[PDB]
Amino acid sequence: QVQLVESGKSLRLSCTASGAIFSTYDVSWYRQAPEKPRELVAIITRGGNTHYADTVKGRFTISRDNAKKTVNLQMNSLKPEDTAVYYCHAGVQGAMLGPRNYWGQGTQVTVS
Amino acid sequence: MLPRWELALYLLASLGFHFYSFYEVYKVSREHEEELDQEFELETDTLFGGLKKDATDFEWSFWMEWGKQWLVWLLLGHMVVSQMATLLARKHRPWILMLYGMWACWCVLGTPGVAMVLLHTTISFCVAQFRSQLLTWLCSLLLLSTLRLQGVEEVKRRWYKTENEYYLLQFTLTVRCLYYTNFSLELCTSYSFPWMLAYVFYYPVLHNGPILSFSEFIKQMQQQEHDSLKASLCVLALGLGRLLCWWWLAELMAHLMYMHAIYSSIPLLETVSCWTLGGLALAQVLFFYVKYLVLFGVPALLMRLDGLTPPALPRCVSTMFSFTGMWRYFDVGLHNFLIRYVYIPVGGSQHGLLGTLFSTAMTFAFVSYWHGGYDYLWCWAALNWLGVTVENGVRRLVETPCIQDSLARYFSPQARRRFHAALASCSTSMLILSNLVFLGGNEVGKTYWNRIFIQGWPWVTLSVLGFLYCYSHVGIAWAQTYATD
Ligand code: HEM
Ligand SMILES: CC(C)CCC[C@@H](C)[C@H]1CC[C@H]2[C@@H]3CC=C4C[C@@H](O)CC[C@]4(C)[C@H]3CC[C@]12C
Ligand SMILES: Cc1cccc([C@H]2c3ccsc3CCN2C(=O)CNCC(C)C)n1
Ligand SMILES: CCCCCCCCCCCCCCCC(=O)O
Cβ pair B332, B325 in contact under 8 A? no
Cβ pair A22, A66 in contact under 8 A? yes
Cβ contacts of residue B395 below 8 Å, gap of 6+?
A: none
Dihedral angle over CA of B103, B105, B107, B112, nearest 10:
-110
Q: Is B385 helix (H, G, I), strand (E, B) or coil?
A: helix
* Residue B152 domain flag: yes
Cβ pair A109, A83 in contact under 8 A? yes
* Residue B267 domain flag: no
CA of B359 to the centre of ligand 2 (A): 41
* Residue B38 domain flag: no
Q: In Å, what is the CA distance from A21 to each residue of B268, B297, B445?
A: 17, 31, 22
Burial class (CB in 10 A: 0-12, 13-18, 19+), B19: exposed
Question: Do both B195 and B334 map to the same domain?
Answer: no
For B319-342, give the DSSP string. S---HHHHHHTTSHHHHHHHIIII
Q: How many domains does chain B have?
A: 2
* Residue B356 domain flag: yes
Distance CA B249, CA B245 (A): 6
Burial class (CB in 10 A: 0-12, 13-18, 19+), A25: buried
Question: Do both B330 and B211 map to the same domain?
Answer: no
Cβ pair B28, B272 in contact under 8 A? yes
DSSP structure class, residue A54: G
**Min Cα–Cα distance to chain B from A66, Å:** 9
Q: Which residues pair with A84 in a beta bridge?
A: A109
Residue type at position B299: P
Length of chain B (residues)? 485
* Residue B462 domain flag: yes
Resolution of this entry, Å: 3.6
Question: Do both B193 and B321 map to the same domain?
Answer: no
Distance CA B48, CA B113 (A): 38
* Residue B138 domain flag: yes
Number of H helices, E strands in chain A: 0, 10
Question: Do both B362 and B460 map to the same domain?
Answer: yes
Q: Which residues pair with B312 in a beta bridge?
A: none
The distance of Cα B34 from the centroid of its chain, to the nearest Å, equals: 33
Within 6 Å (CB) of ligand 1, which residues are found?
Answer: B 14-15, 18, 242, 246, 249, 286, 290, 293, 315-316, 318-319, 474, 478
For A74-96, give the DSSP string. EE-S--GGG-EEEEEEEE--STT
Which of A20, A101, A26, A99 shows the shortest CA–CA distance to B59?
A99
Q: Give one word for B274, left, alpha or beta, with left for phi > 0 and alpha for psi -120 to 50.
A: alpha
Cβ pair B255, B53 in contact under 8 A? yes
Question: Do both B347 and B208 map to the same domain?
Answer: no
Cβ pair B259, A94 in contact under 8 A? no
Q: Which residues of B423-433 are buried (b: 16+ CB within 10 A; e: fewer)?
A: bbbebbbbbbb
Our answer to whether residue B92 is catalytic in this structure is: no
Cβ pair B95, B194 in contact under 8 A? yes
Burial class (CB in 10 A: 0-12, 13-18, 19+), B106: middle
Distance CA B318, CA B320 (A): 6
Q: Give one word for B48, left, alpha or beta, with left for phi > 0 and alpha for psi -120 to 50.
A: beta
Q: Which residues pair with A65 in a beta bridge?
A: A70
Which of B442, B461, B462 shows the shortest CA–CA distance to B451?
B461
Q: Which residues pair with A51 in a beta bridge?
A: A43
Cβ contacts of residue B81 below 8 Å, gap of 6+?
A: B96, B97, B100
Distance CA B100, CA B77 (A): 9
B265 touches chain A (CB under 8 A): yes
Distance CA B61, CA B53 (A): 10
The distance of Cα A45 from the centroid of its chain, to the nearest Å, equals: 11
Cβ pair B233, B304 in contact under 8 A? no
Question: Do both B340 and B219 map to the same domain?
Answer: no
- What method was applied to determine this entry? cryo-EM
Interface test with B, best of A69, A93, A96 (most B CBs within 10 A): A96
Q: In Å, what is the CA distance from B21 to each residue of B17, B18, B198, B349?
A: 6, 5, 48, 40
Question: Do both B343 and B483 map to the same domain?
Answer: yes
Instruction: Pick the last residue of a domain from B226, B251, B286.
Output: B226
The distance of Cα A109 from the centroid of its chain, to the nearest Å, equals: 13
Distance CA A81, CA A83 (A): 5
Give the ligand at the shortest distance from the Cα of B13.
1
* Residue B427 domain flag: yes
Instruction: Pick the last residue of a domain from B182, B200, B226.
Output: B226
* Residue B336 domain flag: yes
Which of A93, A88, A51 shows the shortest CA–CA distance to A71?
A88
DSSP structure class, residue B210: -
Q: Which helix (H) or strand (E) holds A27?
A: strand A26-32
Top mutation candidate among B247, B298, B313 for ligand 2, by most atoms within 8 Å of CB: B247
Instruction: Pick the last residue of a domain from B190, B207, B226.
Output: B226
B50 touches chain A (CB under 8 A): no
Q: Is A39 helix (H, G, I), strand (E, B) or coil?
A: strand
Cβ pair B203, B74 in contact under 8 A? yes
The distance of Cα B367 from the centroid of its chain, to the nearest Å, equals: 12
B128 touches chain A (CB under 8 A): no
Question: Do both B220 and B109 map to the same domain?
Answer: yes
The distance of Cα B382 from the centroid of its chain, to the nearest Å, equals: 18
Range of the domain at B164: 89-226
DSSP structure class, residue B437: H
Which of B80, B415, B60 shows the shortest CA–CA distance to B257?
B60
C-alpha torsion sign, points B457, B459, B461, B465? positive
Cβ pair B356, B349 in contact under 8 A? yes
Distance CA B364, CA B385 (A): 6
Residues preceding gaps in chain A (C to N > 2.5 Å): 8
Distance CA B52, CA B446 (A): 29
Distance CA B172, CA B207 (A): 4
